[PDB]
Amino acid sequence: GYDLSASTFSPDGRVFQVEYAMKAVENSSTAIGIRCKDGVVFGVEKLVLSKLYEEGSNKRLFNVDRHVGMAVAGLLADARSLADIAREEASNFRSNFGYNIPLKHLADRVAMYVHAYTLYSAVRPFGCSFMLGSYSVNDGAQLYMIDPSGVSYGYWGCAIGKARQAAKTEIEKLQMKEMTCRDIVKEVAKIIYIVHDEVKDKAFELELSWVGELTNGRHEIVPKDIREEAEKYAKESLKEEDE
Amino acid sequence: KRFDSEKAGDREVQRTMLELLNQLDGFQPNTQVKVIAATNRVDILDPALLRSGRLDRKIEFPMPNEEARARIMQIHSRKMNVSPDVNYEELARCTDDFNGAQCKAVCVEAGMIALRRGATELTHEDYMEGILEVQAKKKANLQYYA
Amino acid sequence: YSFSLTTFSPSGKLVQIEYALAAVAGGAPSVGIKAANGVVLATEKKQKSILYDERSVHKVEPITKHIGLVYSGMGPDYRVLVHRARKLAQQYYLVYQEPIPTAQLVQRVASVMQEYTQSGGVRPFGVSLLICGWNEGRPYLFQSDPSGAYFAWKATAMGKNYVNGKTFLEKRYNEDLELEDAIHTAILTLKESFEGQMTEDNIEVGICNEAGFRRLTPTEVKDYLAAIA
Amino acid sequence: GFDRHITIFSPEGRLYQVEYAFKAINQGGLTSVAVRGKDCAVIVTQKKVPDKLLDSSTVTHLFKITENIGCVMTGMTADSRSQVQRARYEAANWKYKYGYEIPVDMLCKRIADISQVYTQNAEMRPLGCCMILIGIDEEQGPQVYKCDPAGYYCGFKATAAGVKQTESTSFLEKKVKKKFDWTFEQTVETAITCLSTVLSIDFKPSEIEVGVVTVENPKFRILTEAEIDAHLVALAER
Amino acid sequence: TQNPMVTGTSVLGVKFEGGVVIAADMLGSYGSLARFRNISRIMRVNNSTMLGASGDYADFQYLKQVLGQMVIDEELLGDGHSYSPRAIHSWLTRAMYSRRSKMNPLWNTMVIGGYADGESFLGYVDMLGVAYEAPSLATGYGAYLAQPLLREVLEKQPVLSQTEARDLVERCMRVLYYRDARSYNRFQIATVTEKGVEIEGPLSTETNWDIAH
Amino acid sequence: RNQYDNDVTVWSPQGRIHQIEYAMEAVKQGSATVGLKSKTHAVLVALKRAQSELAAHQKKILHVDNHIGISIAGLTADARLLCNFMRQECLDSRFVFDRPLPVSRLVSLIGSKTQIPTQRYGRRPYGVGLLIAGYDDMGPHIFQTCPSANYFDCRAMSIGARSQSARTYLERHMSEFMECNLNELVKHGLRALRETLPAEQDLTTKNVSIGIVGKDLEFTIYDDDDVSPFLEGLEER
Amino acid sequence: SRRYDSRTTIFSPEGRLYQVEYAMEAIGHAGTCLGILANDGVLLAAERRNIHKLLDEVFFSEKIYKLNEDMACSVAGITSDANVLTNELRLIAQRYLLQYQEPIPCEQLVTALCDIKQAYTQFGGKRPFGVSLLYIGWDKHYGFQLYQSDPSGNYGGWKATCIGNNSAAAVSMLKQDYKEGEMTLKSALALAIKVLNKTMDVSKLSAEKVEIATLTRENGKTVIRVLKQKEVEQLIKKHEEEEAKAEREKKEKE
Amino acid sequence: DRGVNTFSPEGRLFQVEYAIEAIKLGSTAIGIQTSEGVCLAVEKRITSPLMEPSSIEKIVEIDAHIGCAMSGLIADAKTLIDKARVETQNHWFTYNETMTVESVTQAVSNLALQFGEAMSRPFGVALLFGGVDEKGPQLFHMDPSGTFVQCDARAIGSASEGAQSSLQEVYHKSMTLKEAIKSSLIILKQVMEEKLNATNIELATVQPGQNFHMFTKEELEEVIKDI
Amino acid sequence: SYDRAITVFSPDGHLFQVEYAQEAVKKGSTAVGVRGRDIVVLGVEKKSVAKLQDERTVRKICALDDNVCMAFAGLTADARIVINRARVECQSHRLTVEDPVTVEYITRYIASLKQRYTQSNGRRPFGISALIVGFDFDGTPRLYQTDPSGTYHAWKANAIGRGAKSVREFLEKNYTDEAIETDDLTIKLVIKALLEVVQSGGKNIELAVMRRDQSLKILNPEEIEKYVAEIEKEKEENE
Which GO terms describe its molecular function (chain E)? Predict the structure, then answer.
C-alpha cells in the first residue's frame, strides 16, 4: 500500500497521505485555545517570517460567524479555504433554520467536509488543522479541534502546530474550568511565550482573541490594551523564570 | 527491518543485527560502553533496534533554518579571504532548503568563482554565483517568463 | 475513472474475470438440480460461531413468486446483484404485466455483469449466480458467471469443490428425478464436500415448482436431513 | 498487478484493500462489545481519554441513529462519524418515504450496500469503520446487527469489534453456550464483564460507554456515570 | 412573487442635516383585513444604514434575512470596511432589477436611510428597479398625500433641524392615517445619525375628529 | 522527489507539495519587481526583460481597476488569466455596489481562486506571482500573491529573479518609507530594482516600468519616456 | 496522468493496436465458426463448447442468433460481449426498419455494428469487444450475403470463411475446395461437414458438438432454420461414407 | 512527466517547452516591421517536385490588415488562424472597427494554455502576426507558451538562431520596406536548405494602405533576381 | 467522459502517437494517385484478395461525392469513419451553398478532423492517409494527400502505403506532360507506378478513374489486364 493517494490503504490499514497532511500541520508555528468557564480564548504564535510584512498580514484567526472564531495551523491556503467553507456553512444554517449555528454542529459539518476530501484520490486531504471556539448563554463556552483526517473533538484546552505537546503541558498546568477569560488571556500569552523557541524562530508576534460572555457571545480580536498587558505578563514571567 | 520470506531473505545481515541488538540491550548489561548511531532513514530500521533501552535518545536533526544557514556560511567562510560586505542573512534567505554540506558547498564554490578571476574578495556576488551553481537547477531558456 | 480495469492480456484473456472466477471458486459450496417437476437450490450456510444469527442474512433469496436465486462468491456482490435482479423483474412486470421469464431475468442479470466487466472504474462481480425458475410449465436452472455468460444446466455445482460436485451430479443425476428426490440429491452433493456435521441451520435449500419458488424452512430442511442421514 | 485499489482481484480473489480496511478498523485502538437478551440489547465500549484536556463528553463512540436505534462505532473516528451521519440520513429518509421506523436489519443493509459500492468502485476506498447497530424490532425483539467495511451485515446474538474482537467473541461464545435467556441486568453484566475480562482491566464508571434498548423502553439510552457505576459495583460485589 | 397578499403600506423618509429619519406603520394587512398589527417594517441593516419596506411582508423578510447575512459576512471579514448606505442601495437596486428581469418580482418598495462620512443618504429602491436619491421619499400609496408636505417644506427650507424633521414626519404619518384605508394608528420611526441607528418603538399619532360633528 | 512530485494532490512524506514548490520556483524565475507603500501612495517598479534585443521588453504592470494594479512574475498566460479574473471581480463589485472593490477582499478572492486548483487531481497551480498595489478607503495597500494561494500583506516586497537583494534593501529602508513623497517612494523602488540588477547593467527607460496609485491618483502606468523623470533624480551606485 | 489507466486506446511504437489484437487472438482461442455461401442459400456451421452432459438445451441456438426476419449472425469470442453485440444488432436492424419501412441491408447492419466497434477501439478507455461476428443474410440488393467482422471494426464480404479455433486451416481448406458459381446448399453442407471434421480432428464430429443454421428463400419469405440432430447425423454419416470410399479408392490405386 | 499540467523542479510546464522543441523543427519564417509596412517571408519546404508548391500555405490573411506566418505544426497553426479570424470578425461586428495587432495576438495567445484533463496538448506552432493598425505597422511574435511580444524583426523556425543573428547584423530602425524584403530574402536564402527559386518561399506585405498582399510569382522572381 | 490526454509532446518536441499513426499508415497497402489533363486516376493494391472474398466489400477507393473520390491507406475502420463523415459534410456543404464541394474543401475538412483527433482528449489519431482526387465546378483536376497529423498538400502524383517511397520516386521520374497527354497514358503511368511495388500485376491492382465531371468509373479486371498486357508489349519493345 503506497502513500500517493487517499483512496489507498496501507498494508497496515493506515491511510498515509492523511498522515502526511498531519505532518504538514505540525510545521506551522503554534496555536493554543483555552476554554475558560465563561468563554474561549485563542492565541497564535504568528511567526513574522520577514519584517517586510505588516502586523496581522497572515491572520490565522478568522471569524467563522458572529459567535464562532477559528484558529488555524498548517497550510494557510487550505486554512483559508476551510474558513470560507465554515463561513458558508454557518450562513446556510442561519438562512435555513433561522438561528446561529451551534458550534458542535458547525464543527461536525466542517469535519465531514474534511473527511469528504480525505476519502477519494481525485483530491487531497486538507493540510491544516483548526480549532473552533464559541460562547452562548444557553450552551456555555465550547472549543473543538478538527484535524486533516476530519476528527472533531471537544477540548478544555488544546494546542496545534510544532510545540503542541509543550503547549499541552503548559495548559494542563492550569485550572481552566474555574478561571475567567480576562485572566486566561494572560495565561495564554504566557503559554505562547513559553512554548516559543526564540533561538529557532527569533522573530515572533502574538495574535490573541476571545469569544465569551464579556463579548455577548461574539468573537473579537483582543483589544490592544489587553493584548499589551498580556504580552507584558508573559515577558515578566519569562524574566522571572530566567532569574 | 526483518521480514518473512519463503524463498530468500537477508538472513545473515539480520543475524548480525540481532547480535548488535543483544549487545546493546540483552542478557548481559553493558552499562559502561555508550552507543551513538546515525542514519538518514529510520523508516528502514527495524523496530527492535529503535526501542528504548537500545537507542533511547532518538535525536532528529532538522533542516537548518535561516539563522542556522547563515551560521554555517560563516563557519565555513571564517578561513577564507572574506570581503567585509557579505549579507550572510541574504545568503541564508536565498539558500531556501539547503540542508547540510550544501552551505559549505556554497562557500567552496564561491571561493572557486573568485578564483576564476583571481582576487581576495567575495563581495556577495561570488556567493550568489555559488548558490546559483549549488542549487543544481538544470539549464533552461525560461527567459520568456514575465 | 471511466477507463476499464478489465483489459485483454497479451495472451488474449481477461485476467480480471479469471480472478473473479477464482474468488467465486473460493466461495461457499452451492448446488442446483432441476427435477422433472421443479428445481432445488441448496447451499452451505455455515457460520463461524453460534453468535451469528443464521436467520437474518439468507443465502438463498427469492426474486419473484416463481424465481429464486442462490450464489457462490462474495456476499455483498450477491446482495447488489439480487437487488438488481429484483428491480429488473419489477420493470419487466410493469412493462409487460406478466412475471419475468427466467431466461429473460438471467439474460438481464448477465448483461449487468457484462457491463460491470466493461465499465470504467468498477470491478467484475465476484459471485456466480444459480437462478432457478418456473415460468411457463417447465423448470429452468441457469448459472450466470462473473464474465456475464449464462449457461442452462440440468444440474450443477459451484463453490469450493465444484468439479467434484459436478462429477457427483453426473454420476447421480437422471432426467426422471422428482422434486423431493432432487432435494435429496442436492443435500447429498453438499454433504460430499461439507466439513462437519450437517445441521438443519448451517445449510439452506430453496425449491421452485408450480406453486412458486420458496425457501424451505429449517424444519423442512431438518426433515430432509433426517431422511438423508 | 494492483493491490493498491480494490477493483483488481489479486489472482485468487483476496480484495487486499478491503482486508486493509479491516486492519484499519483494528488499528483504531478501541474495543466494543454488543449483546442481546430476552428483551434487551446492550452495547458497551471502552472509553479512553488520555489527556484530561479533552472534554470527555465529546469523546463518544455511542451514537443515536434514531430515537429507537443506537450504534457503537469502531475504527477510524472520522469514517465512523461519516457512516453514522449516513445511517441517520438513511433512517430519516426511510421514515419519510415509507411512514414507519426503519428496521435495524434494513438500516444495516443500506450501509452495507454503500460499503459494497465503495469496494466495487476503484475511485473510493472502503472506509475503515465497524458499525454495530442496536434496536427493538416490533416482532423480532432486540435486534443487534454489525456492518463491516466489506459490506457484510450479519445479525448477531452477541458480537464484538476492535483490537480484541476475537477474544471478546470467544468469551461471548462461551457465555452464550449456556442459558442465553438473559434479563436486562444479566445482559448488561455479561457485556461489561466480557469487556473487563478481555481487557484485563477493572472498569471505573468513567472509561466505558453503555447504550441500552429495552422492550419496555425502546429508546436508545446512553447510561450515565451513576448507572454505569451501579452496574460495576454490583458486578464487583457478585 | 406574482401575487402580493400580505403587504405593508406607505413608508416615509426625510433627510435631517446630520442624519436621516424614516417612518413606517406596524401593520400587516390582507387587503382590508389587518391581521398582524405588531410587525416592524423597518430594519437596521448596519450601524449606519436602515431599511424600510412598503410591500409584501414575506418578500421584505426575505430581503431582511439576505441583507443581514451579507452584512454579517462583511463584519466577519473584519477588514475595516463597512457597506455604505449607497452600496446597500445599489445592491438592492441590482437584486430587484434582476428579479424583475427574470419576472419573479420582489413585491417591495424600500426606503434606504443612512449616514456615512458626514453625509446623509436617502434612496427609493422599488419593485421594478427604479432608484433615486431625494431629500424626502414616500414609498407606497402614501406618496400622493405625504410627498406634497415634505417637498414643499424642503423647498422653502432645504435643511431641516431635528425637531423639524421629527414633527414633519409625525404630521405626514398623521395625515396618512387620516386618509389611507390600510393605515394603522401605531408606527415606528427609525433615525440614523453619527451615533448609529435608533428605532423609537411603537409610536401612536394623536388625531383630531372635531370635524366629525 | 520523483514519485511525490508529479501531482498537486500528492503529499510528500515531509508534509510538502512539490508541485506548489515548483510553481513558486516558476515565480522566482520570473523577472524582478518591487512593490512598496507609503502613507498615501503605493508604487510597483518592474524590471522588464527583452527576450531578444530586437524584441520589446515584456510588460509587467497591468491595470485591474482605477485603484488597483498588479506586477506579474512568472507564466505570462497565467498572469493574464489572473488579471482577467481581477478585472472581472472589480467590475462585478463596481456593478453591484457603486464602489471600488477593497483590495483586502480582491486578494482574498484571488487566494481562494488560486487555491481551488491545488486540491484537485489533474490541475496545477497558477504559475504566476503578483504584487498587487492598490488604494482604498483604508489607504494604500501592497500585497504579494503566490502560486501556493497564500497571500501576504506587505509594507514592501520584491518578487522575481534576484528579488532577495531588493528584499534586503527594503528591509533596510522601511523606516524611510511611509514618510516620503511620491518621488522619493519611486526612487526607493528604483533603487531596489537596481540592487537586484547585476553590477554590469543599470536601469534605463526601456528597462523599467512604474505603476503608481494613491489618494486622488488613479493607478497610472509609466513606461518608455514616461519613466525618465523618475530616473533623472536617481543617483549612481 | 493516472497510474491505473492502462491506456486501452493508444497506438504502439509501431502502429499496432495491442488491445484489438489481443482481442483477435482471444477470438482465435474461442470456438470455431464458419459460413458458406451458395446460389440457393447460405449456411453457417459452428462448433459447440457447451458439450457438457449436465448442460440443458433451452434455446434454439447458442452460437447463432437471429437479427431480423432475413438475417442471422454467429459469435466467436466472449459470450457476454457477443450477447450485447447481438442485442445492439437487433436494435440497429429494427431502428432501420422503423425508419425506412424495409429490412436493413446486411452490409448496412454490419457497417453500423462495425462503427460501434471502431468507436470502442478509438474513444474512451474501455476495452474492445473481443467478439468476431459471421453474418448470413438476404436482401433485395445482392441476395444471399455472408460477412465477417472483427473486433477492430473491420468487416469483409466472403463467399466462404471461418473464425475462431483453427480458422486458418478451415479457410485454407475452403479456398482449396470451394467452387464460385456452383455448390448449392447440398454441397455446401457437405463441405462444411468435412471442414469441421478436419478442423476438430480431436473429436470425430459428433452431431451434438456442432450447430448448423441455414438461411434460404421460399415464396418470397426468408427462412432461417437450425438443422436438427437428425439432419446433422445424416450429413455426418454421408461424409463418413464418402471419406471411407475415398480412402478405399486411394488404397486400391496404391 | 505524467500529466500535461505538471511543473518541473526548475519551474517549467514541460508541455510548453516540449512545444518549443517542436517549433525548433519547423520551416524558417522571418518577419520585419518598418515605418513603411511589415514583411513576412517564410521558407516553404518542398519535399518532392510532385508537391504543388502553391498548396503550402504558411502565410495566411487573418484580416485585410493582418497576416500571419506560421512555423512548427501547420495544422495547429490552421486552428489558431481560424480562431484569430473569427475573433477579428467578431470585434469588427461588435465595435465596427479593426482589431489592433496587439489585441488579436493576445486574443489568440489566451488560447495557448487552455489544455487539461478542450485541447489535450499545447499548440506546437509559433506565429508571426504582421499587421498595420492605428499605431502603424506592428509585428508580434507568439510562441506555444502564450507569451506574445512585438519585435522589430523576428525569425522563428529551425534556423531561428542564425536568422535572428543575421537580422541583428542587418536590420536598422530607419529602413524602407523594399530593403526589408531584400534583407529578409537574403537571410532566407542563406539559411535555405536548397536553392531559392521563387516557388519555394512565400512572401507577404502589409502596408499603411493597400491590404495584406501575398507576392505573386512575378514579384517574387523580380526580387529574387535583384538579390 | 474519459478525458485523458492521449497525444502529447515528447521531450524532443515530437507527437509520438501521431507518428505511430503514420506508421500504421506506412504498413497499409499502397494507393497511387495521379491527375492528368481531363482525368484523375486512382489505383490501389488489392493486397491478397482471397478467391472467397467478395471484392465489392473492399473499398479502398470510395466516392465522397459526384466530383470527389478518396483512396485510402491505413486502418480500414478509420477509413470508413472518415469517409462517412466526409460524405455527411459534403452533403451539408451542398445544403448550405448550392454548389458541389471542392476537392480542396473536402481535403481541408478531413485535415481539420484529423487535427481535432490528434489534439482532443481521450481520442487517438486517425491512423490513415488519404488521397482526395476530383474535379471542381470550373473543371480542373485536383489531387490532395492528407496525413494522420492533419497536414494536407496538393500533389501531382502520390503513392501512400507500403511502397510509398519507391512509387513516389518512380513517379517523380517519368512523369511529364508527354506522359499524361491522354487518359490511356495516364492510366498507364498509374499502373506502372503500382507495378513498381506490387509483385504480381492485374490480380493485385484496382483502378478507378474520373473523367471531366462525368462520374467515377472502376476499371474492370479485364480492362486492367489489357492495360498491363500492352504495358508489357511496350516494355519488350523497348528491350
Answer: lipopolysaccharide binding
